[PDB]
Write a protein that holds these residues in place. Structure first.
Motif, PDB file in Angstrom:
ATOM      1  N   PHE A 179       0.821  -1.212   0.000  1.00 43.65           N
ATOM      2  CA  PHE A 179       0.000   0.000   0.000  1.00 43.65           C
ATOM      3  C   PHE A 179       0.857   1.265   0.000  1.00 43.65           C
ATOM      4  O   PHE A 179       0.680   2.143   0.843  1.00 43.65           O
ATOM      5  CB  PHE A 179      -0.944  -0.034   1.195  1.00 43.65           C
ATOM      6  CG  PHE A 179      -1.674  -1.335   1.341  1.00 43.65           C
ATOM      7  CD1 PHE A 179      -1.446  -2.152   2.429  1.00 43.65           C
ATOM      8  CD2 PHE A 179      -2.557  -1.759   0.367  1.00 43.65           C
ATOM      9  CE1 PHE A 179      -2.111  -3.359   2.558  1.00 43.65           C
ATOM     10  CE2 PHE A 179      -3.223  -2.962   0.483  1.00 43.65           C
ATOM     11  CZ  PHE A 179      -3.001  -3.764   1.586  1.00 43.65           C
ATOM     12  N   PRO A 180       1.789   1.399  -0.954  1.00 43.90           N
ATOM     13  CA  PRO A 180       2.645   2.601  -0.969  1.00 43.90           C
ATOM     14  C   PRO A 180       1.863   3.898  -1.165  1.00 43.90           C
ATOM     15  O   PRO A 180       2.396   4.971  -0.872  1.00 43.90           O
ATOM     16  CB  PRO A 180       3.606   2.346  -2.141  1.00 43.90           C
ATOM     17  CG  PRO A 180       2.802   1.525  -3.085  1.00 43.90           C
ATOM     18  CD  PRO A 180       1.885   0.649  -2.219  1.00 43.90           C
ATOM     19  N   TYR A 181       0.629   3.830  -1.651  1.00 42.08           N
ATOM     20  CA  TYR A 181      -0.242   4.993  -1.719  1.00 42.08           C
ATOM     21  C   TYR A 181      -0.839   5.366  -0.361  1.00 42.08           C
ATOM     22  O   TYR A 181      -1.490   6.405  -0.264  1.00 42.08           O
ATOM     23  CB  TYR A 181      -1.371   4.738  -2.724  1.00 42.08           C
ATOM     24  CG  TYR A 181      -2.140   3.437  -2.473  1.00 42.08           C
ATOM     25  CD1 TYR A 181      -1.728   2.234  -3.057  1.00 42.08           C
ATOM     26  CD2 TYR A 181      -3.280   3.416  -1.655  1.00 42.08           C
ATOM     27  CE1 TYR A 181      -2.418   1.047  -2.834  1.00 42.08           C
ATOM     28  CE2 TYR A 181      -3.979   2.234  -1.422  1.00 42.08           C
ATOM     29  CZ  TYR A 181      -3.544   1.047  -2.015  1.00 42.08           C
ATOM     30  OH  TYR A 181      -4.247  -0.128  -1.793  1.00 42.08           O
ATOM     31  N   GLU A 182      -0.667   4.541   0.676  1.00 43.59           N
ATOM     32  CA  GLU A 182      -1.019   4.933   2.041  1.00 43.59           C
ATOM     33  C   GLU A 182       0.215   5.244   2.882  1.00 43.59           C
ATOM     34  O   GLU A 182       0.267   6.280   3.561  1.00 43.59           O
ATOM     35  CB  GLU A 182      -1.876   3.844   2.715  1.00 43.59           C
ATOM     36  CG  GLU A 182      -3.310   3.908   2.195  1.00 43.59           C
ATOM     37  CD  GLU A 182      -4.156   2.702   2.554  1.00 43.59           C
ATOM     38  OE1 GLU A 182      -5.317   2.666   2.089  1.00 43.59           O
ATOM     39  OE2 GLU A 182      -3.678   1.804   3.283  1.00 43.59           O
ATOM     40  N   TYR A 185       7.136   3.221   0.817  1.00 41.05           N
ATOM     41  CA  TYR A 185       8.172   2.250   1.144  1.00 41.05           C
ATOM     42  C   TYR A 185       9.286   2.937   1.921  1.00 41.05           C
ATOM     43  O   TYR A 185       9.500   4.142   1.796  1.00 41.05           O
ATOM     44  CB  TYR A 185       8.759   1.614  -0.121  1.00 41.05           C
ATOM     45  CG  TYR A 185       7.765   0.869  -0.976  1.00 41.05           C
ATOM     46  CD1 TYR A 185       6.989  -0.158  -0.435  1.00 41.05           C
ATOM     47  CD2 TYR A 185       7.611   1.182  -2.337  1.00 41.05           C
ATOM     48  CE1 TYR A 185       6.058  -0.853  -1.219  1.00 41.05           C
ATOM     49  CE2 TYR A 185       6.695   0.494  -3.136  1.00 41.05           C
ATOM     50  CZ  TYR A 185       5.918  -0.536  -2.555  1.00 41.05           C
ATOM     51  OH  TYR A 185       5.000  -1.224  -3.317  1.00 41.05           O
TER      52      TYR A 185
END
Ligand SMILES: Nc1nc2c(ncn2[C@@H]2O[C@H](COP(=O)(O)OP(=O)(O)O)[C@@H](O)[C@H]2O)c(=O)[nH]1
Ligand SMILES: Nc1nc2c(ncn2[C@@H]2O[C@H](COP(=O)(O)OP(=O)(O)O)[C@@H](O)[C@H]2O)c(=O)[nH]1
Ligand SMILES: [Mg+2]
Ligand SMILES: [Mg+2]
Lengths: 295, 326
Positions: A179-182, A185
């Motif tokens: 979930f890199p949009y939350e 990384y």
């Protein structure tokens, strides 16, 4: 012959292979050096040896003077990997690394595996590590935190008195973060995720309602790194032997952040116990003394 | 007075927005919040009581599980199959975006959603049946949000021909414990005189990573399922008898091991890449999975208390079952 992992604690009881441990830690050229212990710990088949393999590639490139490799090169190195052995393994080669300023220190790589008799071994690697890298899949669950709380308390209990905090650094290493949009990384995404996730878990589960305070009472530093998925070829191969290019791009990018963050000479923290730095010899003595307590 | 032609034109634009605003999509039919369970009877009856399907025996295919496990993604491929079957490679062409009526385009809502369009399919031999697609979603993370997820999970189990229990990577103790709970909660409302309370249970295991242990697909999933269950029984006493419990509630239990769909699907909140950007093995296994569920010879009419249920009878069960949990 060649370097490789050495079984030093083996698991219903546990045993220290003292001769195996001592032959590594008592070698003439590292025996009296202050030791830096990097420990990766968690359940079977979560990619611990894969990440240790990249730590080795960093260490061997630094020893031999881009550490990751050319895309076309197979990973072609000493590799950490039934592998379903509960216990502790240490890499047979201790690395000597010069810190900025000239102090030379010894670097030990440690692997702790188990699925509770495993409380002892997770406690032992926590008590003997400069950084405990708690290796989890995808997210941090209630059971991950219950277990963490148990083996850190169990380790703290084998240390009679603590003028400071019992342990040094804890890193939550979250594998296959999706979930890199939350949360991005790496470290800062990982930090924002960890504190929110602990707050949510504590409020859902009375068994770990104080786990944040407990963790912070145990460790002088607590961080979290969100690592991408390595790609389907790594995920579906028992023993990945492909080339660097067959590993997902973002995983490799985040490796170039994570690995030096742990192993760059200026990040190596000597192991401390009782407020004093520990040599390789001292490490051996502590393994012996702690093992005695748990027996 | 407006011109005749302009009147019919304005009526024409009125009927244009009518069809566009009621385009096929998911309909929230059972909702939870705060607790308590509400059933949108008007919405559900508008689906199930359409003239042409009201009295057909119904085939109910339900996908069920926790949030963010790819349930609506798999439902979208089921829709692609069913829309293909309706008027005509159902998967699509490689260079094209995944296009079609979608499910997630139409949510952290706990409850049940049903596709607004009922499909009528002719089985081998000529019997036409109605096919209903259902999406069941809720969390069972905590001590709260566990009683209510049991209720809606029981509800879609009681009303489905096949309950596709959608799990990530493996079958865990908590998946089996919640299964035991909601099949128990659903069992009570059934009278269990003429038939087992439920029909088919399918463990759909997503992102299977061990094909060298158990092959992707059905035969691998069946070799995996039984041996996985015996392990979890031995480890957690709370589900010590889960295999016998499962086989007493369902007349069929299967398991399908599905590949990972690729990093692009995994890391995008609403995937709109090309078909070629979905993992090759995922698409291969989809071509086995989706016909295994939806091919005309595989459609199992919903049965309750030993008898086949129609669409209209399915409405009445939803209205009745919901009052029991109240
Ligand atoms: N999904 C995924 N698989 C990985 C990762 N790292 C390694 N693997 C694969 O997972 C399996 C277990 O890896 P291994 O390193 O032996 O795990 P260990 O038992 O914890 O040491 C192997 O097939 C690896 O190729 C990762 O970050 N994600
Ligand atoms: N790893 C993985 N991700 C998936 C799969 N199917 C869908 N996704 C992704 O998972 C996320 C949640 O999918 P979604 O269908 O909305 O989950 P739902 O809440 O259960 O309906 C989205 O980013 C999808 O693109 C799958 O089989 N494996
Ligand atoms: Mg290992
Ligand atoms: Mg859904």
């Amino acid at each position: 012959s060649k370097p490789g992992p050495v079984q030093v604690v083996l698991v219903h009881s546990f045993e220290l292979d003292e001769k195996a441990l001592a032959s590594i830690l008592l070698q003439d050229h590292i025996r009296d050096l202050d030791v830096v212990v990097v420990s990766v710990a968690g359940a079977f088949r979560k990619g611990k040896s894969f990440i240790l393999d990249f730590m080795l590639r960093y260490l061997y490139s630094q020893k031999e003077s881009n550490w990751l490799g050319d895309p076309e090169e197979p990973l072609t190195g000493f590799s950490w990997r039934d592998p379903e052995t509960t216990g502790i393994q240490i890499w047979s080669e201790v690395f000597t690394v010069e810190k900025p300023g000239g102090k030379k220190v010894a670097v030990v790589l440690m692997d702790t595996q188990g699925a509770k008799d495993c409380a002892t071994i997770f406690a032992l690697s926590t008590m003997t590590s400069s950084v405990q890298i708690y290796n989890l899949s995808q997210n941090i669950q209630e059971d991950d935190l219950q277990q963490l709380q148990l083996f850190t308390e169990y380790g703290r209990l084998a240390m009679d008195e603590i003028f400071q905090k019992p342990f040094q650094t804890l890193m939550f290493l979250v594998r296959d973060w999706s979930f890199p949009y939350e949360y991005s990384y790496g470290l800062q995404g990982g930090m924002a995720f960890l504190d929110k996730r602990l707050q949510v878990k504590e409020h859902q589960h009375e068994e770990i309602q104080n786990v944040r305070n407990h963790i912070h009472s145990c460790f002088s530093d607590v961080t979290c790194f969100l690592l991408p998925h390595p790609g389907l070829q790594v995920a579906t191969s028992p023993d990945f032997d492909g080339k660097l290019k067959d590993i997902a791009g973002e995983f490799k990018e985040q490796l170039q952040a994570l690995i030096p963050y742990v192993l760059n000479p200026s990040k190596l923290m000597e192991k401390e116990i009782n407020g004093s730095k520990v040599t390789c010899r001292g490490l051996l003595e502590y393994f012996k003394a702690y093992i005695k307590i748990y027996q």
